[model samples]
Target chain A: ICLQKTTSTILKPRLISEGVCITDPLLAVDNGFFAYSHLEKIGSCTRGIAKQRIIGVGEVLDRGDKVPSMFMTNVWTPPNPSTIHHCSSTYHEDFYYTLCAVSHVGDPILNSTSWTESLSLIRLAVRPDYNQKYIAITKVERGKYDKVMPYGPSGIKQGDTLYFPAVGFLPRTEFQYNDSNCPIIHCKYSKAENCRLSMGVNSKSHYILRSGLLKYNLSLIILQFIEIADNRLTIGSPSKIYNSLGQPVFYQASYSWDTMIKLGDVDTVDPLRVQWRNNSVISRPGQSQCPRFNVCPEVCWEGTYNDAFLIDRLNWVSAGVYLNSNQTAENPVFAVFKDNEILYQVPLAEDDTNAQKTITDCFLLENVIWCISLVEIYDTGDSVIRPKLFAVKIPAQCSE
Target chain B: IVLEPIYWNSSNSKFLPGQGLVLYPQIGDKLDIICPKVYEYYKVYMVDKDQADRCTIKKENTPLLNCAKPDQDIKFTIKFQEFSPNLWGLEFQKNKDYYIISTSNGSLEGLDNQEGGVCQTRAMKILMKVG
Candidate 1:
């Protein structure tokens, strides 16, 4: 065995830029430090929305604190002009910058800046007050087209006071002053004399339910994040409510396409995937019918499937994870809790016990995931929160 | 014997009307008066003093339910009753027009008897939001 391997270590690290020449020794080290931190920020908050979602990454973390295993924040946006960065910033830069960032797993030694272990983070994004996804509503109460056009199909009846959601975001609560968002979208059917109705749809009919726009942009974002990271992403808790018998229900109903933005170089993502295990079901008002065991049924708007053909409808919208052919993976489960009726259980398998203890080890593993759950109106006349997007971050571990 | 318990949310409070304490009803529900009182006809209303923190009531269908008006004297009185375990009752009054009383605790749970008013059922409540 006569094999020789040569190893060389460089002292006083230096960063080299293609068009620049460095004659000063101190400048070399400074550039090295700058590049190192640049790489760190790139991994921690490549997407700017994550930083905007929080107050800032500077509050509790410093140069060497253990990166939190998870960082999550909810955000809100408006529905006008459709500008990035909340209709501001003339920069029009394709990317936004993170205010500050910290990772959960890290060593802080190897690079004094790099995560000891790669950590991945998910952006659970939200924008509760945007209405970009507009739809035309036509209400047929009692099987009669009492109203037509966008005004007729809204949730509010003709002649009724309508409310539009406010333009900011806040925690979900119940009260008057506590109510941050406006509830009315004030619009009326010009044909209906002087009656006021919700500017949305009012009829609890089947045809009316089928007429709204279907926005799956949020779903596409989740898929892109996960796919962009490849299969290296790991979910923490796959349950929503956290009960034993409670199957990990995916709360995809709460997602809104208006809240999601696309950010990849590719454009081949499909929002609707064929469901072999988890079926998509539609529910309606006064219909009393919901999804039954093993059967993913589509709610028949009104009484038949005439307009159903106008739109491509399917049963069993993707529910569980499609890891392989036979074995299905359950995650982001909307678990049923005993104390409360049901709540969402994120199946990322994380806690103080499992969270990265070392700062270096935290960012190396991408364990935190966020999703948008929006309730959609279906033929059944029921609004159901559909798990639209699952935003997962890719850590340096898999990339390494 | 009017007993109505005030509810901040869905939870009920301990205060009620007939421990001899009286309060005024909010605008939606009407009170039928059966008494002809003294020198001055003062329509007394017992409002939950605690409700002072949040909601207000008005006899006229005005948007503002301010009790600050000199004519519509809205007041709160508390006293420990001697019914085994003593409880404090929050009451309101006007002058001497003894017209109405809460059926139970201030908690507006279940159903109201006088004009057959009822709180929305859970499903209906959710359905309303859905609309």
Candidate 2:
């Protein structure tokens, strides 16, 4: 919608909270435009952090190519000592020249514009650095806590890092969506001295098989690491190796004399070149243990005939069109193609073609239709009429 | 031996020994690295050494770089291969010195602090600022 053209003097009356008015006396009230601050920003103190506030709604001064109704520039204010614009019905002697007090909208703490203060807030928003160990967990069941307090036991405190098998925790997709907005765990304790550990308890222990130097000889390796305080042992979760199948793997290990610790790095020499399919081969029976299949079987096709059918048709149809139950007429059966041609085939009819011939019309006889068919008698070798009864059937047809 | 093709972020400046490197303006800044593949924005990071070494020309997460510093002599060679092809081999140096071969531009040049290193540093600064 085109913003209304009004004098800067009249603009103030129409403005809501967070609305802005530009004042360059040289730029007259009649021609000068006012940019509206957000109504949401009115009482909220965080509005000051927005990069752009006063978006010009004035007349397009330029007539070059296409002209925007108004021009906008980045304008914002610091909180606290800096003032925010809010509109109220308070009266003043010079009504048009009313000056809003900075105190009316500023906060000493929440709106502090100090760089250091803002930096801390910004750091809080960033998930802790990759090497840090932090997990924000909500209190599922409120209970009296013997430990893990000061920040938790009730609401939510960052939890210590818990290690799991790499096989179970590897990201199975190209992109992952994390809807949990829980903040990353931040600990007040240091890594070298004060630290705590929580184990990932399993009912039964499992082992992973690794390839050994000898052929056909498998080595059972338990790749495990310890988590010490917030220090070096407090590393982030195992990073995924993206696309390693055929490439030669490089093995490099480093040792520190001062720390007396040796760290081994095993990674592929190449970036992950393999693009993971949304669906993949199981390679083994009972391989896909998706829990979603138990509760929401329709969503998970694994270990079912549906999965087999889907895999068989993978090259034929990549995706299917979803439709409402009542919208059959409009529903489309998506066909997979190779060279700009679909792979669909028409099915044969149940009736025998040799015995049945084309009929002009049909008469309903009891449960079946008796139609006239043309046939040739072996002895006469002449076309003769024969009656063939076939069960009535309605075949599916395409509808535009 | 076959050497994996490596790529780097055009804007990455600093290098760490092994763990990973850091990016500009720290976190929570207004800027981001836009992926050419999906055209999605992502937070630029101090990509780990291994990830950077294996980066491909195809745009994905962040542009990866091959960072190698000489323990002794800084002289090394760099070469940019095609977008993709049947590949080749490499011979290793005893000093563990490495080089950043340009892909889209430039050829192997010595890092001598003579008449060239100054120009190279200045050119890099200009390239990063423009990016």
Candidate 3:
């Protein structure tokens, strides 16, 4: 008993708090991303952000290599729903955070800057389900609703306008927001200091906007697979394709901040000869087959721009860290549903750089939250572009 | 076993006096006590009602068995079949390494270093023996 206790003391950081719940459960399972969180409060200690520098040069989208198309779907549910207070205008203690993100490659060098400069979709997509949807977090001005207006139309908010070219059909039929008397108020707030927007911010102080419990779920998507990240015409290797549309005309994938899309055994299409037809039909000239959609998506991301020029293939590195008291290896890889099973057996290729590398070396550190910032990387002949910076909260699985 | 009484000098370390230890028991010889990994030199007294028994350690000052200086690991052993069933006492420096033997009577003695392999280092002279 004494030896056991001593061993435990030497290996500190053994326990963790309960995890956050997610809205898009299916999507959350597909990409193997769970929740990234801090305390129930928003402004106490900041979350950690992790960043990597890549200099690889490639074009093919293999199973293990860096793919071009990458997306993340995450869910968030309060630890204890009934215990938390509910609000009308701003937030409810029962409410938690659920986010999804998509990262495509434009010009390798330019895309980083553009994605960073805008981070447009950061706070956009006020989608609780399939029902009413709102884009943009802030508004230029307020209207009678006393509620703040969503951003997309306002020119340039931190996360203002991220264009999606192939918006699949079934927008109204497939997605329905949570319908309740509480009414959804998609408002703009700070990514780091929006305490009033979160739950239990006033636990210590006697603020009028006080709530007992606040549990937020943050899902991070380190997009690994990709083939393209340009305007409406985004395509990637077959392995990079998660879910597809029925009877698709042009084969394409989609990404969003709040959607529950996953890869089920939806009818698969063998390579079909593809031929472009005017502006209505977009096809790959050399390829024989393309994605077929049963219907067109309600939202059209026609103008989404690609800021990068060079695309060095990079794979998505999904990590789930809990920025709370318990810091242990128990933070398992979020369950990923490819067609069905939760497996991390993504066949990877050799690093070509390091000799002693294995699958274990591929995971991101658990625990310690991450911090984020945006830095402008370039100014085309006319406009400026920015890239999001993710810094590590605390180092883990390392030798000091 | 003969009792070669030896004295501890100020320069010695690794093993010290008054501690509980179990030699790597050979086949049929049972042991129940275990100690921490911190001693090098030791002294002790042992007595058997009948036959001779032996305890063996390595030439290096480690609990690890069959390893060099960089590989400081030693293994404990008590050679000799099921001939005697008696409790023996030992003493040594806090963390130094050495080899020693316990006699049928209440006397203890040190062994020579040329034993090759793990038992390469010469054992220190026995400091005391009390029946």
Provide per-model DockQ scores.
0.02, 0.03, 0.01
Scored by Cα lDDT, where does model 3 land? Answer: 0.18
RMSD of each: 24.6, 30.8, 29.0
Tell me the tens digit of each residue's lDDT in model 3 across A262-321: 111212122112221112211111100001121222111111111100000121112111
lDDT of 2 by residue, A1-400 (tens): 0022212121100000122211110010111221212212222122223232221112212234222122323222234323322210111111111111122334211222221111100001111132111122222111121111010000000122111111111111221223222112342211221111101111011211111010000131111221111212211111111111222111100000011111112231111111222222111111011111111111111110000011122232211111111100111112111222323311112111111111111122233212111111011111221212111111112211
On DockQ, the stronger of 2 and 3 is 2
Instruction: Provide the lDDT at A172 for model 3.
Output: 21
Q: Stretches of candidate 1 above 4 Å error?
A: A1-54, A57-94, A97-400, B1-131
TM-score of candidate 1 relative to the true fold: 0.19
Deviation from native of the Cα of residue A318 in model 3, angstroms: 11
Best by TM-score: 1
Whole-model lDDT per candidate: 0.16, 0.17, 0.18
How high a TM-score does candidate 3 get? Answer: 0.16
